[PDB]
Symmetry: D2
Subunit: 121 residues, 4 copies
């Protein structure tokens, strides 16, 4: 299992110790407060009122927690995933990333605290 | 395991099928959008800017998800709990509740979708 | 989870730290060598050639590992149980017992090493 | 998870659907009755009285359940493994095998019923 912080300004993302393998079931829980620029902060579902202006994940709001598994496209995490199985052919190291527009991470602040574990399978 | 909706306006709370017993390890993941009155909505950590004016749980923000286990006091849930063990002497049915001031739930809206499972122990 | 030794000569049985509660899923693995009297020893399935002459569990062989949950009747364990749920209305402390005839445990020898854990549910 | 039968006469072994990956925790429970030649049968720990005359696994008795993980050497399973982690650098498909001497499987009989699951990690 892995526990760590994902900084909102970390454009490259936070690599974890989890390698997602075919058949794995995982659970993620994410908590905390972060911002994509404003003084206000939002939780791991991000800001439901902010327009998508080129987010790395178009299936989640700006300021949401997302992930990549190996060389996958981004997958929403939001507050977490409960006993979750990846799509077919998706495997590799899990990297967690704050959802923002490439090149605009510099004014970001805060972080999410995230737990990932593998479940029975 | 249990999955269901917790309505923001449900003052009595949403009873689940989970009976927390001594030694149990549980995981909760909560998602969604709710409000304690305003047109804006917040996630399961609630509104970090709103003053506590008599919330059922003073250890979480207004609009956060909280719970009671049996006849316990309220315990924050927020976005969820990862492989969590209850304090000593805490046991019984888990009821999930939106954090608001008693008697002020009528203007609430939205809901959270919540999964609870028991983990290995 | 619990790990410990179950002595073949322990007529009252070995109490564990596991309280089986409604809905629990458990796994047991049992190992080792024991005898109900002869110099030969048998594993946790017991001796398939020995007649039942009043065993505490008539659904397992003499020399098998069995259990009681609370005040239940005996339930075969044998080599173990994989992600197992008890019958309706069965609950309480798990006691592990060597299967022999009441009053004939004195000439027994050896023991089984047993792990019990609760699984996801 | 996988459940299936491992025939005592299956020299090549029974391939399972489990791929053991680095970091995995697994549980195995094995049950049943098999023989390496005699009319008598033994459980998954085999025959503690039979000399080793070239067994595929010298760390378990003749007639015991053993396994290979990928291209590993044989590893004892016996009655099972509880929340078990493999040695460093061991990974791949799990094949279950009855422990006997190469070229002497033809007179074997019976089988073991085996469950394998991955546990939390
Ligand atoms: Ca930004
Ligand atoms: Ca309100
Ligand atoms: Ca005896
Ligand atoms: Ca043979």
């Amino acid at each position: 299992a892995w526990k760590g912080e994902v900084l909102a300004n970390n454009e490259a993302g936070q690599v974890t110790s989890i390698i997602y393998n075919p058949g794995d079931v995982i659970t993620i829980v994410a908590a905390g407060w972060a911002s994509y620029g404003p003084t206000q902060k939002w939780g791991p579902q991000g800001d439901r009122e902010h327009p998508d202006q080129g987010l790395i994940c178009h299936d989640a709001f700006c300021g949401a927690l997302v992930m990549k598994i190996g060389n996958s496209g981004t997958i929403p995490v939001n507050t977490g995933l409960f006993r979750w199985v990846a799509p077919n052919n998706v495997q590799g190291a899990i990297t967690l990333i704050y959802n923002d527009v490439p090149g605009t991470y510099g004014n970001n602040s805060g972080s999410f605290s995230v737990n990932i574990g593998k479940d029975q399978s």
